[model samples]
Target: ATAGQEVAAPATRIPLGTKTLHLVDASRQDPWKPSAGNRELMVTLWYPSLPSREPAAPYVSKPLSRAVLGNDVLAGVRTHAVAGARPAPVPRPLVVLSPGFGMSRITLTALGEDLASRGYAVAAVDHTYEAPVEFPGGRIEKCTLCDDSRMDPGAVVRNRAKDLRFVLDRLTGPGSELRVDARRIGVAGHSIGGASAVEVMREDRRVDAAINLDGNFFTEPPAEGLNKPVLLLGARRSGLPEPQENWERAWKQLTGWKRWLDVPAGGHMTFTDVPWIVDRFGMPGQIPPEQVEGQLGTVSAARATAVTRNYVAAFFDRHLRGRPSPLLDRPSSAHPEVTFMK
Candidate 1:
């Protein structure tokens, strides 16, 4: 590489622990729910450590394939086809993520990669029964568990929460690809996934922390308050004088440290990799590229990645690493688009 020249710092490939499964019903001879630690998944775990000479694996489960085609097909960013590094002896703690309903884990790619670069191991799960995933075999599927009339909201939340705990257990068990810090684990979810994060914190002790990314509280959550630190990050959709009431109720449940951040003008899409998706397809009624990314040449999609990177980093840095980030303390003029719930 020439002096001061841009050297692609290796395609930011985070070696992920991978797996895939078809949900099965041990009772009815039907396959529907995603059980925790269930061997029926194409699960991929991403961690920071020594890079591998081997090619990385691809991202997206069977269902995610459809979500991209149906929702974000325009970006033209193919799933990763390389492997990641060997986690450091003392690698960053693991953070598991659940995307909004019907959305692929890909929606959270920017945040995942950002954390990967910063040292945290992130597992962005494609809730196969609920998300649009493109599995390795080129199979596409949607969340079968989302049949509202047939689905029990509470049960599903509990199940998804368990699935996360199950993931931690597997990754840390034996010579698993993930050597996570059990006590340092955190969970986050968007939309319905956010609700599930709360449930995980309520039900699981291993999850020391959690974050709800713009999700309304779904089930009548367990009485246990957040025993550990938690954050409530909402999109511009809730930036008005009145906020989401369900979130406020959940806020009252915070027994430990908590934060409420509302993106002043950012849409629900802003919290996701939707910018990149929309930029490719230009969703109707969406703010134009200049407005979303920024007029200064950064697209709204890119602006979103910028905001997500700054805040997500600050949030974990403060809690997991015990670092200080005033950004989480309150809103700042530096990024007027973001509003803090005082």
Candidate 2:
């Protein structure tokens, strides 16, 4: 289901700029579609920018909207960032983002824009063959794995981790268009993308921190433990006995800075733009009302956005920017919806 919606403007005053990149790892072949030769990915970068007259970026292409939602419903959605605007001169910390399984990187536009406005170089990646990714020249790669009943979750997580690592290399390497502080990097994602964040941290020492937004761990936690900072932001599970056991298992091995925050009113898709889109445009016909409610929870779109943006930004601001955030230390009255889980 899709809808024409407007992502709320970023809370920060700094202007945001957006651009897309088509990256191919010649060294690795596509794991899902090996016939494609190289593992290709589409990345969208959102960074702080000097004020310009550039137009706001389009939410999603017409073909992508149709492919994902069965219609061009997202064609009229409005995003806050300006397209191809000049980036700020300062070298900013990089936060590589990955979307949920079977979801486009465009779904993370709100978080990316908000993070960029707050002065982080945000790169949101679309893992090929897992979602509908529109590459350069309007080539739309549909999700082939969605219908594959025998698909392995662990393999998907591993492949996504590789995609993220390659993205980091390209973004932080010499001659990169974005000025990034390679030494201070973070990874975050929604759903399986969130699990991929943790998977990448174990594989790459360059990742100083990571945040998993309501994603079950498809891959096992590092046995020796992870010393880097990590934030586990999960949805509310009322009387469900915490179905995802991986978080508890992961918590024991988080040897460094860590926090487990739960949103009592949030659903599986709360951390993404789905709740906002559903709230603004009404539920799509394809999904039942109960399913939408269960997936999105009872949180209002504005509240969910604020809570997500504030907490995610705080984590990055504290770890990447070395600016301690009091919000991470304990609960606050401002965001009563968020519960600090021990």
Candidate 3:
């Protein structure tokens, strides 16, 4: 190897107990396939784990890991979680996560693991046909939504909201094997998934709170305005001041406890895994070394992640677990990048 050659390493991950649920809502027909009938969803749960020697789950299934990163790239990724470990005895609040458009649930693994380690039940939802998904038995599904140029953003948001409802039903209903508290549930998401969180809170009374990370709210919220807690965190580029116009419109409709935040130099991808992994593995050809910081804002990837993780955990803690988080009340000198919105 050349002395100047750069090496790519797997993104470091947190340890938590993880499992998957194959949920089918027989009452509704498949949105992507009309004749196929029943709507199906694949959800992954990360929760508190009792220490054990169980093998860590792969970052994604082998097929997906190989297809996206190519060669042996993602194979070496370090995930500290134990696959199918027994859940902890104590009841904990559940947070349902939805990834951005064209992204699978695995993209949010870093955040999910962190929340679980901190004693929250994390369920990342993969909206079928919207993202590439590899289920058990070696059946892999590709992203069908990517090819549709005329897709309606509002319709997509509503559909994802419906998906969230089904997931909660399976997780908390009778004969459910999951051990999280059914009474307390929240939803948060990235991009369109974030918009869907708002839709879910308005449509489903079971959701206690919701958060939208760096998403432009594309759907019109409830006409009477939402009465539950919500948060909107956006990315700010060099000269741009506030988030997009849609978020401003959505904010006017949030009649409940709410806050608006923008990462000073962060971009749309900052709140997701792209910045972290790109900072580690890097791009293929000629590109600035600071490319990641440029996209995620001037803040270093580590700082971006730290700020995001803390805020998300705090927001959920305040609302879901009945814990007080002053972090939500005002900015902290320790993390100066987070600027509050008036």
Candidate 4:
């Protein structure tokens, strides 16, 4: 049983490679499950690699697919990255990726692969109990935070911030396997995960830049303003609806380099792989058609993927690599759906 096709291929020249790591932060206890003791995380690394015949990586583990997608066959969804391939010798900037609430790190596979192909080391973290994460020995950790009515959004962002910081320590600290330029570090995330990017930046000075993709800030921005680069990429909706108040508040508090770009046709999940996967795989009974439309919007999956990948990559290239992208300067005729907001 297989999904029988690949997701959209990344439009970059360099080949991609990937590996996964199970990390445990001994200093912290799991906030969702106190009995779990240490906070454990599953992280996926995507990097530019030497060309090899290594098999293409699966979008996710079979157990994860079954738990999230309602069918194990969806695990066969293919990615452009090779598994366990050797990383290219070039030391590159590092970008940490976080997925939306109730989504696995695999939800950002397309973005991670695209960034790696563009010469950056990418790490996507699965926030243990916030999503169904599969660990070694077939142990699957469910999302206890999702169903807890007592859960606070502030707690979620703070916990995710700690997870991101710990991942950075392991990836860039001494004895790390990958070659990372510690000076150039960026973070990007979808939905609430996007807010987590900002939260982590507030807590960790090592993060130089952050991007928030269609997420309302759960934790308030400081009154003094964050003097770092931040991108607010949002979706387009009808009826002259007012922008989220949190985004408006955050915009005023972002005192450094910033841009607010909206995709008039995209939905909340457009920045994620959900739109692309549903477009190709047709979840059928698993997810209703209207629900899918509400999540993916009227924009075609291909367009959303290109828009997200290009803008995100451009933001990092300019901030982390000192490369300028005309796309960030103003709206272009090429991508008519994207409009710069005041």
Off by over 4 Å in 2: 1-5, 242-244, 282-286
Q: Is candidate 2 or candidate 3 better by lDDT?
A: 2
- Better structure of 3 and 4 per lDDT: 4
Which portions of model 3 show Cα errors greater than 4 Å?
1-15, 70-72, 237-243, 285-294
Could you tally the backbone clashes for each prediction? Answer: 39, 0, 2, 0
Task: Tell me the tens digit of each residue's lDDT in model 2 across 37-146.
Answer: 89999999999988987668779888997887677767778787888888888889999999888998887888988999888999999999999999999899889999
Q: What's the lDDT for residue 336 in model 3?
A: 84
Cα displacement (angstroms), candidate 2, residue 172, comes to 0.6
TM-score, every prediction: 0.78, 0.95, 0.90, 0.95
How much is 175 displaced in model 3, in angstroms? Answer: 2.4
RMSD of 4: 1.7
**Predicted model with the maximum lDDT:** 4
lDDT of 2: 0.86
lDDT of each residue in 99-209, candidate 3, tens digit only? 999887887877888888778888999888788877778877777778888778887898888899988888888867677798889899998898898889999999999
Ranking by lDDT: 4, 2, 3, 1
Stretch of 10 with least lDDT, candidate 4 = 237-246
Clashing pairs in 3: 265-297, 266-296
For candidate 2, give the lDDT of residue 68.
70
lDDT of 3: 0.77
